[PDB]
C-alpha cells in the first residue's frame, strides 16, 4: 500500500503519494527520507501495514518497500535506497547511507 | 517462530465493544414530554454509534457473525441521597421495523414470542446471544445500492444488515425519587467470517448512518493531508541527535 | 542523476508502497488512535427515536 | 474451552482455533 | 488474445483473477430460487465498450459503479431489465496507452461495495449521485475514494496499475462479490471500476487529448426471475 | 542480481571474470603467514560506492587505484588500518546511464599495476600524485593511459564497455593480483579502475549533468596482522 | 596459559564460568534478525587491557561496564560504532599482584545488569554518571554496592577472589546476560565489573604503587546491524 | 442440553429434537 | 488443581510443580 512519502505542506491531497523527483545538477544528492515507525505517526501510518499496526503494540518481521517509478519510457536514471539501522542520526550525504 | 494467532479475525473483531449508551431518567413521567424516555428505550441494533468498534468492522465488506450481547445497567441519582435501588429490566428483542412498545407497562412487554431478558443491576450484567440473522450469507457492512425499489431508499442501509431492536425497560413502577439509569450494551461479535478486506477509514466519521467525511481542519487525518505534514520529503522529524 | 529527453517531463514522480513479509507479526492488542470521537455522531439518536 | 450447555451451535464461545 | 462472445481485444497480458477468484456459475447447492436461470452466453459474455474519459492534468479520477454502467447496452441491458434477478462476473479491460514520451500512473481499482459518502454535509448520496449510468462518474476527492477511507489503502483491493512507462493496459477479473448469490441490478451496485491518477498525465511533446477507454465484458451471467421490462 | 553482503545491485547482466579468475581466499598451501588470517565477510564484502564524476563533453578520463579509493570507507577501511595485511578480490560494477538520444563509449578498463608517468618530466610521480584517494583521479593523456603505453592496447586488460546505446553499466570482477599473497595496503594498489571516454558524450537534446557513479564491492577479504591503526 | 586470539596471558589457573555458561555464539533457533550476523573472530575475541588503577590504601573500589569499556577500543570498537547489534560474551583476567608481605584481598565480582543510585537524592544517575568508558568508574559507597544492596550478599554474582596471600589474579568468564538475545552497546550494559578493597593493602616494608590492572577479553562475538559509524 | 439433576422426567428441558 | 476452561496457556494456576 501506498506510503505518503511527501507529507509536507503545500502537498495537498493526492500530492503526497507521489514523490517528485527530477534532474539534479549536483552530485549524489538526496531525494527523501522516510520515517520509519510503523506504530507511531507519519509516512507509514496510512498504510496496511501501518493502520492495523496501530491496532496493536508489539511488532516484528521484516518490511517490504516498492519503490514504483512513474516517469516515461524515455526517462532513464538509476537510485540507491540506503536502509540505515538506528542508533545514529539520518545520514544525509550517499557515502554515509550505503554503509 | 513467531505466533501469529492474535492477529486472526475472530482474536481482531471479537472485543466485547460499547455499541449503545442511553442514561434515561427513572421518575413520574406523568408530566415529561414526548421525545423524552418513559422508563423505556428502543435501540436499532447498530455496530456505528461508537466509531471504535465501526472502523474495525468497517474494515471488511462482508461480515458473518453472532452479536453477544451484553447489556450492562448502571444507577445513579437525579437533593438528598439514599440507597441505590436493585431495579429489575426487560431487554426485549424485537426485529426490525417490528412493533416496539410506546409505554413502560404496555402489553407488548409480554414477551409471547419475542426473546426477552429480565434482569437485575445487582447481578452479573445480562449477556444474550443473538445469532446470524441476515437473510443474506454475511452482513453487508458497506451497501452501495438502495433497498427500496423506488427511488426514495436509503443510500447504503440495507435493512438485511440491520440486527433488529433492542427494546430495554425497567420493570419496576415508578419510584418517589427520580434515578438516572445508564444503560451499556456491549456487542461481541463471533464465530466471525470476514471477506474482503478494504481500506481503513482515516478521515472522522459525521453520521451512522452513512460514510460521509469532512475530515480534521489540519494534518493529521485532515481532507487534504491525512498523514501530519513535516518540513520537506528530505526532513527527518524523529532523528537522532548526539 | 535523472535524464530525460527534450519531450519527456522532468518531474518525475516515484511511488512508493510498503508491505510486510511473511515473518511479520503483531500482538498486545489496542485501541486504535487514528480514530476516535468527542461527540456522539449524527443521527445517533435516531438509532433510538 | 468446550462448555456449552445450550441446544444451539451459535451460543458456543468464539472460536478462536487457527 | 481475450475473445468473450463476438468481442475480442488483442493483448500482448497481465491479468488479475480478483481476490483470487473466477467468475463462474452459480452453484446448484449454492442456489436459491427454484427455477432453472437463464445463461445468455454468447449474447452477454462480451465486452462492452463505455465511452473514453478524457485523461488530463487536472482530472482526478473517474468511477463506473458496475452493472450500473450496463444496465442499458446489449443483450446484458435487454436481460436486465426483463429479469428480477442476475449473478455476473465481470472481465474489466481498461485501455490507457500515450507515447513513450508521456509520464503517468492509473491506479484502475475495482471496489466492492464502494458505499460513496458526500463531503462536508450529514444527508446521504441521493439516487442521482450514485446510479449514474454508463456515463460514470468524477471522484470528488480520489485521496479519500469518496467515503472517508484512503487512497494509499486502496491497493487491498483489486487493482492493476497502468503505468504508462510500463503498461497500456488494466485487466481485473472480478467475480460474483455480494452476500447474496443473484441480487437486484437496479437498486444494487456490487463492484465499482474506481480509475484514478495517483501521478498525472505530464510531457514535453505536443499535446495528445489522451483518453481512457474502458471495456467491462460480465462473466458468467445468469439472469432469472423473468417478466416484462421497466 | 548483484547482492553481496547487505549490499545490492539490482541488474538485468554480463559481467567480466578478470583473466578468467573469480576471488577467492588465500589457499592453505599457498599461504605464507603462520597465523589464521581473519575473514570479514558480509561486514567488507559489499558494494562501496564512490562519489560519482560528472561524464562531461571535455572530459579526459578517471582512474580510482585500489584499494586506495577504500582504504577510509567502512569496515573495509577499519580492517585495511588495523591489519597489516590484506588480499582482496574486487567487484567494480560501474554505473553510467543517460537517455536513447545521448551517444558515448566507456573503456571502463581494469589495469593491473598501473604504474603511472608524469609527462615532460624525469621526476618520478609522488605520494600525493598517486594515492589520491576516494576523490579518484583524472587522466593527464588518457590517450596513453599516463604511462607511455597505448590506450588502443588496454583492452589486454580486464576491461568492459558502456556503450551507451547498448548498455548501461559495467561489471568486472578482479581476482587478487598481485606477486605475493598478500600486500600492504598502504603503500601499494594493485588494481586500478581506468574509466575513459573514448567516444565522448553528445546529444542533441536539452543537457543533463550525467554522471559515472562506481560501485566497488571488495571481494574475499582476508586481513592479517592485527595492531592499532593508523 | 589463555590465548585468545593473537593476545595471550600466561597463568599459573581458577576461572570463573559465571553462572555455569561458557560464552557462545547466538544459536540459530534463538536468533531473532533475519540477516546472518558477523562473527569478527580473533579481530574482537582477545585481550583488552585497560588502564591500571592505583591499588592504594584509602581506595573505596572500582567498576568497569562492559562494553562500555570497550566501546572505543581496537576492532571491538570499531565493529560496536559500525554495527547496531552486538552479543558478546567476556573472559575478564584481573591481574594484581605485590610480594609476601602485602596483605589484601580483591572482591573481584561481575555484577549482571548494576542499575546503579545516586546517595541521599532522589534524582538518577545520569548519562555521565554511568557511561564513564574505558575509564571506569569509582564506588562511592562500595559497603552499599551503590545501589542499596549489600556488598556481603554479592558474592551471588559471579566473583573470584584476589588474596594477595593466595593468588594474583581472577579470572571470570561471562557469558550474554540480556532477556533479549542481542542489544544496543551505546546505551545499555549487561556486566560491571567491580572490583572492591574488602581488606585493604596493608605492608610494613617500602610502599611501592600497587596497580590493579585489567584484561577483557570479550568473547563469541556477534554483530548485527551493519551500516556507517558513530 | 442433558443436565436434568432431577427425579422426574417432566422437569426436564424443552424437548426441541426434532 | 486441574482447572483450566480458558482457551490460553497463561491463564492457568501457578505451576507450583517442583
Known amino acids: 500500500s501506498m506510503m505518503e512519502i511527501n507529507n509536507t505542506e503545500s502537498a495537498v491531497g493526492m500530492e503526497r503519494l507521489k514523490v517528485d523527483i527530477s534532474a539534479l545538477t549536483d552530485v549524489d544528492q538526496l531525494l527523501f527520507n522516510i520515517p520509519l515507525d510503523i506504530q507511531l505517526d507519519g509516512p507509514l501510518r496510512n498504510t496496511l501495514v501501518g493502520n492495523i499496526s496501530r491496532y496493536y503494540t508489539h511488532w516484528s518481521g521484516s518490511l517490504e518497500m516498492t519503490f514504483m517509478f512513474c516517469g516515461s519510457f524515455m526517462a532513464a536514471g538509476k537510485l540507491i535506497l540506503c536502509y540505515t539501522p538506528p542508533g545514529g542520526s539520518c545520514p544525509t550525504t550517499r557515502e554515509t547511507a550505503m554503509l | 517462530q513467531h505466533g501469529v494467532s492474535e492477529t486472526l479475525v475472530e482474536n481482531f473483531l471479537s472485543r466485547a465493544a460499547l455499541v449503545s449508551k442511553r442514561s434515561f431518567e427513572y421518575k413520574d413521567h406523568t408530566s415529561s414530554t414526548a421525545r423524552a424516555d418513559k422508563n423505556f428505550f428502543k435501540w436499532t441494533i447498530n455496530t456505528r454509534s461508537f466509531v471504535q468498534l465501526r472502523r474495525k468492522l468497517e474494515l471488511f465488506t462482508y461480515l458473518r457473525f453472532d452479536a453477544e450481547i451484553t447489556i450492562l445497567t448502571t444507577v445513579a441519582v437525579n437533593n438528598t441521597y439514599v440507597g441505590l435501588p436493585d431495579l429489575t429490566l426487560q431487554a426485549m428483542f424485537v426485529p426490525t421495523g417490528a412493533l416496539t412498545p410506546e409505554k413502560q407497562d404496555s402489553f407488548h412487554w409480554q414477551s409471547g414470542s419475542n426473546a426477552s431478558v429480565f434482569f437485575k443491576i445487582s447481578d452479573p450484567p445480562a449477556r444474550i446471544t443473538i445469532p446470524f440473522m441476515c437473510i443474506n450469507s454475511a452482513y453487508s457492512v458497506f451497501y452501495d445500492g438502495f433497498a427500496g425499489f423506488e427511488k426514495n431508499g436509503l443510500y447504503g442501509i440495507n435493512p438485511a444488515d440491520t440486527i433488529g431492536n433492542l427494546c430495554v425497560r425497567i420493570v419496576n413502577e415508578h419510584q418517589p425519587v427520580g434515578f438516572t439509569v445508564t444503560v451499556r450494551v456491549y456487542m461481541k461479535p463471533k464465530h466471525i467470517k470476514a471477506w474482503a478486506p478494504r481500506p481503513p477509514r482515516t478521515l472522522p466519521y459525521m453520521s451512522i448512518a452513512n460514510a460521509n467525511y469532512k475530515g480534521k481542519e489540519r494534518a493529521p487525518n485532515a481532507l487534504s493531508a491525512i498523514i501530519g505534514n513535516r518540513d520537506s520529503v528530505k526532513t527527518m522529524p524523529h532523528n537522532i541527535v548526539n | ?49 | 474451552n468446550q462448555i456449552n450447555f445450550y441446544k444451539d451451535s451459535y451460543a458456543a464461545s468464539a472460536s478462536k482455533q487457527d | ?230
Open chain 3, 1 to 49: 542523476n535523472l535524464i530525460v529527453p527534450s519531450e519527456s517531463s522532468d518531474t518525475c514522480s516515484l511511488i512508493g508502497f510498503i508491505a510486510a513479509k511473511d515473518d511479520f507479526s503483531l500482538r498486545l492488542m489496542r485501541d486504535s488512535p487514528d480514530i476516535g470521537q468527542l461527540d456522539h455522531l449524527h443521527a445517533a439518536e435516531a438509532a433510538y427515536q
Open chain 5, 1 to 230: 488474445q481475450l475473445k468473450l462472445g463476438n468481442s475480442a481485444i488483442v493483448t500482448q497480458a497481465n491479468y488479475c483473477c480478483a481476490y483470487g477468484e473466477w467468475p463462474n456459475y452459480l452453484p446448484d447447492h449454492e442456489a436459491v430460487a427454484i427455477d432453472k436461470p437463464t445463461q445468455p452466453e454468447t449474447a452477454t459474455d462480451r465486452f462492452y465498450t463505455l465511452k473514453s474519459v478524457k485523461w488530463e492534468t487536472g482530472s482526478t479520477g473517474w468511477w463506473w459503479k458496475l452493472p450500473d454502467a450496463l444496465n442499458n447496452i446489449g443483450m446484458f441491458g435487454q436481460n436486465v431489465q426483463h429479469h428480477y434477478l442476475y449473478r455476473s462476473g465481470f472481465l474489466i479491460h481498461v485501455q490507457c496507452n500515450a507515447t513513450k514520451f508521456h509520464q503517468g500512473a492509473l491506479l484502475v481499482v475495482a471496489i466492492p461495495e464502494h458505499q460513496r459518502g458526500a463531503h462536508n454535509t450529514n444527508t446521504s448520496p441521493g439516487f442521482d449521485d450514485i446510479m449514474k449510468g454508463e456515463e460514470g462518474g468524477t471522484f470528488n476527492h480520489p485521496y479519500v475514494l469518496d467515503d472517508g477511507t484512503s487512497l494509499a489503502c486502496a491497493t487491498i483491493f483489486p487493482h492493476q496499475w497502468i503505468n504508462l512507462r510500463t503498461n497500456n493496459s488494466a485487466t481485473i477479473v472480478l467475480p460474483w462479490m455480494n452476500a447474496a448469490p443473484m441480487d437486484f441490478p437496479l437498486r444494487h451496485n456490487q463492484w465499482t471500476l474506481a480509475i484514478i491518477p495517483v501521478v498525472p498525465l505530464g510531457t514535453r511533446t505536443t499535446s495528445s487529448m489522451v483518453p481512457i477507454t474502458v471495456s467491462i465484458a460480465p462473466m458468467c451471467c445468469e439472469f432469472n426471475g423473468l417478466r416484462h421490462a421497466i
